[PDB]
Ligand SMILES: CC(=O)Nc1cc(N)ccc1C
């Protein structure tokens with residue numbers, strides 16, 4: 463009885479219930495409450511050797527494995543969630559997308575325009591919410607819905 467895409471889950475380590483969104487891969491302790499023509503998102507992309515274009519402004523030849531990319535994504539999420547780092551700072555420094563130079567901002571878009579998993583996560587996020595790891599042919603994304 464939860465917003466689109468949410469399910470109850472059980473923490474293995476602590477035994478406490480949490481909520482998981484299978485569209486955004488977000489997870490959180492707190493019970494979520496609750497479609498625009500357009501949303502605005504920022505993202506942090508980590509590419510891997512199987513990315514559509516395994517090359518970025520950071521690295522002419524991206525050689526990391528998808529597993530390694532996911533560990534990096536997980537570490538960025540941890541630091542954003544802890545407040546040790548800001549999303550925008552990590553995107554500027556470490557996103558393999560050319561949008562890193564705009565602190566990850568992709569601007570506004572509607573359905574049909576972005577890769578489908580990215581699109582679906584974006585529209586399932588509430589304004590201000592952040593995804594978990596989202597997989598596309600580009601690689602692995604942390605998505606921040608800003609509008
Ligand atoms: C992939 C993409 O959209 N990149 C980008 C986004 C913004 N906002 C500014 C400049 C660039 C190059």
Ligand SMILES: CC(=O)Nc1cc(N)ccc1C
Nearest residue numbers: 575576577578580581598600
């Ligand atoms: C963020 C995103 O999904 N970008 C994108 C969208 C399409 N349609 C094709 C290729 C890329 C890289």
Ligand SMILES: [Cl-]
Nearest residue numbers: 518559560561
């Ligand atoms: Cl590009």
